[PDB]
């Protein structure tokens, strides 16, 4: 049951919606992954921050194992005993009054859009159905029809039927564009990533988040912060927005929310927003099921108890400094916060990000290329400094091998 | 930590998007649920068919426990060893060439809509972006903006911003309406439930599915069968559509696909449809992760090995006959297939479905009301005949108590 057999089998029986890096994992623990040949790799993607806590963290594993013997899903037609414990926990952790639980990140984004529209019509007073939601170019929040209706990436939306109206797009990291867009009284919300992940770890300028908060407040517009990738210690704070002491109106969480053990996502906001959705008006079969809730409690507890945000801050400083010591001839840019980082290489035709990642794979490190000139470096947050310096030397060997 | 404490806690810290039946479960096993007071109930909802295999089925539990120690999520940037095994398994089980794995049922529906639109533009030749998808009134396939854009239930779509264009609605169980709708050359697909679940277990007339298949083929329109609730033995066949030997172009699976242990959904179709989506054009973080795949393999195996479809067929015949022995003065209708059934009561003001379900709860049986006059009866498929007859007597006691 080799790696090539796995590639071929998936090519035969599975959709071709991905072209993954040709490596076939079968075990994961902490910062490490093992393929079916027994080869060991540093994971420098962390499943897009879903395993911030490392792969198969034993406390989250134990929470899942303990709960799976009791009860896993009643549906929301009845109550289960776990959901409320988790809701109190996560709301008090992030100091929002309420949470709406969902499963995937895009379901959290859709929930946020529905909340913004319902609030805009029933509270702000926009006429049905004139509500607009503003997004930043380069945004990524999933693959539903709506989500790709706000994309600026043609691969996401081209050929996928007519698009959700009411979505306007402005440049990222651009306060004057936001002010100009918010002159429109029918804007109900602005949704933005504090750091754009899929776009290539694009870090906006100091003050951007503060200005977004001020503009949204001034024009009674909801500030939706998509922290599904940037949150939960990955950038060195509980929320990337904490770097500028900014309180969004809606915060979206996911991925690391379960440590990779279960699709859990969360929409956090206060009553004046959350309660515009009445009973029967929104939900999900698996949303708030007790199994996901137990593992999400454990995953948040791991993040707090092992102080992973402080570790991500320190080791990210180290990582970026070392990466900046790479030649300007070859690495065009280094950027990121905490342990969410990326490099931009000087792509030729002899040489692109895909080849760099193939060779990183050869040398024991797994990283994702994002367009042909960007490579993300994002190891799990439980990585130690010596493991990080070994990985950095793998990166150096690989980059200078060309 | 009583039941009222649980209600109050969720009301304080959680969104109010549900009004559940006031019962607080903490354990589930097979056909039974236990609340925090230790009271025992028959589950006659089965989490909308997600626990067809019963709550916490030990083989699915063991699959989850075995896999969670190995690897739970690499993301689709790399390969994992499990996904292909599951894809071969489920494609050979349902005799479709390929499966696209997702997490929730609505993600499967959105994937199906995107496939229909991409196929309609790139294969059928519809001009961008004129593709239409036809739905039946009473349809339910989730809570995204798109999904509610095709709803006829005002509680689903009212107040939720402008709607996805390209979605047309025709009456359910209505072959002439489908023929008239399919005169439009720009229709790419018709999506329909073989039995409408959320609408109140509406069973279309014999021959409806056959006529839908013939019409879709005649007008080169894709037949999307939503079997997320009706599939996986709940109606007495592997697929409800098997009752009429009908092969849809796209089949949607979910819920029971994991036995309730993990959000797993599947989109099944052949190459000429599936491969219109190219690498990079669709996906999901958790879609096809190895943990969900292991439990989905185990859940399908449980359905086959315990012959749960045959059991559902036999016990559903028994259930409907006994329910039809209830007074016409009180039970207006009985309907369903296999163990997906519902009754319609003669609602007054002294008396509605909500009160009937409160009293069923009092007498040890948990059922969901769906509008105020419909109550679903849908126990897990591992129920035995004697347990079923005890439950039927609970139903009789309750209905005749009024
Ligand atoms: C900031 C943000 N918001 C929402 C979502 C959606 O969450 P999801 O619906 O996947 O669970 C994501 C998801 N990012 C991912 C997932 C992935 C793939 O789709 O393969 C590649 C990628 O960049 C996100 O980064
Ligand atoms: C036929 C069919 N297709 C797709 C979906 C969506 O799957 P999902 O996104 O929830 O996982 C469902 C979901 N039915 C449910 C879920 C539920 C609630 O939303 O509370 C009440 C209800 O009737 C379905 O019955």
């Amino acid at each position: 049951p080799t790696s090539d057999d796995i590639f071929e089998r998936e090519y035969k029986y599975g959709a071709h919606n991905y072209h993954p890096l040709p490596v076939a994992l079968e075990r994961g623990k902490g910062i490490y992954l093992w393929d079916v040949e027994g080869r060991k790799y540093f994971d420098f993607l962390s499943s897009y921050s879903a395993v911030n806590q490392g792969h198969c963290h034993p406390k989250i594993v134990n929470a899942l194992k303990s709960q799976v013997d009791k009860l896993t899903l009643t549906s929301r037609a009845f109550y289960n005993n776990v959901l409320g414990e988790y809701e109190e926990y996560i709301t008090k952790l992030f100091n929002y009054h309420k949470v709406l639980p969902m499963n995937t990140g895009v379901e959290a984004g859709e929930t946020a859009c529905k909340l913004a529209r319902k609030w805009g019509y029933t509270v702000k007073g926009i006429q049905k159905y004139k509500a607009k939601i503003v997004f930043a170019a380069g945004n990524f929040w999933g693959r539903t029809l709506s989500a790709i209706s706000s994309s600026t990436d043609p691969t996401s939306y081209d050929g996928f039927g007519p698009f959700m109206p009411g979505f306007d797009i402005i440049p990222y990291n651009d306060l004057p564009a936001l002010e100009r867009a918010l002159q429109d009284p029918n804007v109900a919300a602005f949704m933005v990533e504090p750091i754009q992940g899929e776009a290539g770890v694009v870090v906006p300028d100091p003050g951007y988040l503060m200005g977004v908060r001020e503009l949204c407040t001034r024009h009674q517009v909801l500030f939706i912060a998509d922290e599904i990738q940037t949150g939960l210690a990955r950038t060195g704070r509980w929320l990337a927005v904490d770097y500028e002491n900014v309180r969004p109106d809606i915060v979206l969480l996911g991925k690391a929310l379960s440590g990779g053990l279960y699709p859990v996502s969360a929409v956090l906001c206060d009553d004046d927003i959350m309660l515009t959705i009445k009973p029967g008006e929104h939900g999900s079969t698996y949303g708030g099921n007790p199994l996901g809730c137990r593992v999400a409690i454990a995953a948040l507890e791991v993040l707090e108890e092992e102080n992973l945000a402080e570790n991500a801050d320190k080791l990210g400083i180290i990582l970026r400094n070392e990466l900046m010591k790479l030649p300007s001839d070859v690495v065009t840019a280094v950027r990121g916060k905490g342990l969410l980082n990326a490099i931009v290489i000087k792509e030729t035709k002899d040489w692109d990000a895909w080849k760099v990642c193939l060779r990183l794979r050869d040398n024991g490190l797994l990283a994702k290329p994002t367009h042909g000139d960007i490579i993300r470096f994002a190891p799990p947050l439980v990585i130690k400094e010596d493991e990080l310096r070994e990985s950095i030397e793998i990166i150096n060997k690989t980059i200078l091998s060309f």
Side-chain angles (χ1 to χ4, degrees), chain A residues 1-7 9-309 311-402:
Chain A
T2 195
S3 290
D4 190 80
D5 293 332
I6 283 166
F7 307 153
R9 200 217 263 123
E10 282 201 36
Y11 193 88
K12 184 167 172 87
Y13 302 113
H16 298 172
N17 50 314
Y18 285 94
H19 186 139
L21 199 71
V23 60
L25 292 320
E26 78 165 309
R27 188 161 55 99
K29 188 55 96 170
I31 68 178
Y32 292 122
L33 283 169
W34 292 263
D35 72 7
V36 291
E37 285 74 32
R39 289 177 290 207
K40 188 170 158 186
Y41 306 83
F42 287 96
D43 185 348
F44 262 60
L45 178 61
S46 305
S47 304
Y48 305 103
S49 291
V51 295
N52 288 351
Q53 302 89 332
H55 293 274
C56 296
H57 190 291
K59 174 168 148 134
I60 316 180
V61 170
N62 283 340
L64 182 93
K65 278 173 165 178
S66 170
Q67 185 61 32
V68 74
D69 293 315
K70 299 201 231 297
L71 174 67
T72 69
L73 177 74
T74 64
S75 85
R76 304 292 305 277
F78 318 111
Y79 292 82
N80 73 78
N81 65 301
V82 181
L83 175 58
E85 190 181 336
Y86 160 78
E87 292 174 331
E88 178 166 8
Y89 182 51
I90 197 176
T91 50
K92 294 196 184 313
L93 181 48
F94 294 94
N95 187 256
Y96 286 90
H97 293 126
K98 280 181 178 55
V99 62
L100 200 156
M102 300 288 286
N103 312 283
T104 60
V106 68
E107 285 184 335
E110 296 256 3
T111 297
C113 291
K114 291 177 68 169
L115 281 167
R117 286 168 165 202
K118 196 95 173 173
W119 174 91
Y121 297 134
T122 57
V123 183
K124 180 165 180 183
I126 303 166
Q127 290 206 359
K128 303 175 172 175
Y129 284 104
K130 296 184 184 176
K132 297 292 207 237
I133 303 178
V134 178
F135 300 79
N139 70 88
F140 185 96
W141 53 283
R143 300 284 196 180
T144 55
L145 262 357
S146 295
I148 74 194
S149 294
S150 74
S151 183
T152 65
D153 176 9
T155 67
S156 299
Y157 67 86
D158 189 356
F160 286 123
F163 303 105
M164 174 58 54
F167 290 176
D168 295 331
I169 301 170
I170 63 169
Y172 191 59
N173 190 28
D174 190 339
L175 292 176
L178 183 55
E179 187 153 38
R180 181 170 69 178
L182 295 195
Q183 303 305 307
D184 181 354
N186 292 321
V187 177
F190 175 50
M191 179 188 297
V192 62
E193 301 155 75
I195 295 180
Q196 285 186 330
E198 156 81 28
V201 186
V202 183
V203 182
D205 295 330
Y208 176 64
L209 300 179
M210 302 167 54
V212 165
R213 170 72 276 176
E214 156 163 17
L215 280 174
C216 285
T217 299
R218 162 140 43 84
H219 294 284
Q220 214 189 207
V221 170
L222 305 183
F223 178 6
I224 309 175
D226 187 346
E227 297 248 22
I228 290 168
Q229 267 195 68
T230 59
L232 309 180
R234 159 66 51 189
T235 66
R237 303 298 124 111
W238 268 109
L239 299 179
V241 92
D242 296 335
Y243 273 107
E244 301 201 345
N245 309 288
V246 160
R247 190 163 183 279
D249 296 309
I250 306 176
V251 172
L252 309 184
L253 298 174
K255 298 181 175 201
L257 187 54
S258 76
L261 270 69
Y262 203 103
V264 182
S265 66
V267 176
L268 291 154
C269 54
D270 284 342
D271 281 359
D272 62 328
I273 297 167
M274 193 68 91
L275 299 187
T276 67
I277 288 183
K278 300 216 280 238
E281 296 183 351
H282 184 69
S284 167
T285 301
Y286 279 89
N289 71 85
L291 185 48
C293 291
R294 285 297 193 209
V295 333
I297 291 180
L300 296 166
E301 282 175 339
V302 166
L303 291 168
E304 175 168 324
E305 283 168 11
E306 306 192 14
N307 291 284
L308 298 185
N311 197 47
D313 199 4
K314 163 167 191 59
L315 294 195
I317 291 173
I318 295 176
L319 180 49
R320 289 189 296 283
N321 282 337
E322 298 302 316
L323 289 173
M324 278 177 296
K325 299 199 275 206
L326 280 178
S328 273
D329 312 38
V330 173
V331 179
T332 270
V334 174
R335 62 199 179 213
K337 274 180 142 153
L339 285 171
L340 182 61
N341 305 276
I343 64 165
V344 187
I345 63 176
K346 182 130 62 64
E347 171 183 0
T348 73
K349 271 172 295 176
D350 319 339
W351 188 69
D352 56 43
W354 186 259
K355 300 178 186 172
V356 178
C357 286
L358 289 175
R359 191 169 295 184
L360 287 167
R361 174 206 62 178
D362 295 347
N363 293 330
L365 188 148
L366 292 182
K368 174 197 179 199
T370 332
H371 267 117
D373 60 336
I374 300 164
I375 302 173
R376 177 184 309 193
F377 293 131
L381 310 186
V382 295
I383 191 171
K384 304 168 200 175
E385 170 167 0
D386 47 336
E387 302 163 328
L388 181 76
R389 297 196 176 270
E390 188 191 342
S391 314
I392 292 173
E393 277 315 318
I394 291 188
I395 297 172
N396 289 342
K397 173 201 206 296
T398 302
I399 301 283
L400 303 177
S401 315
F402 291 95

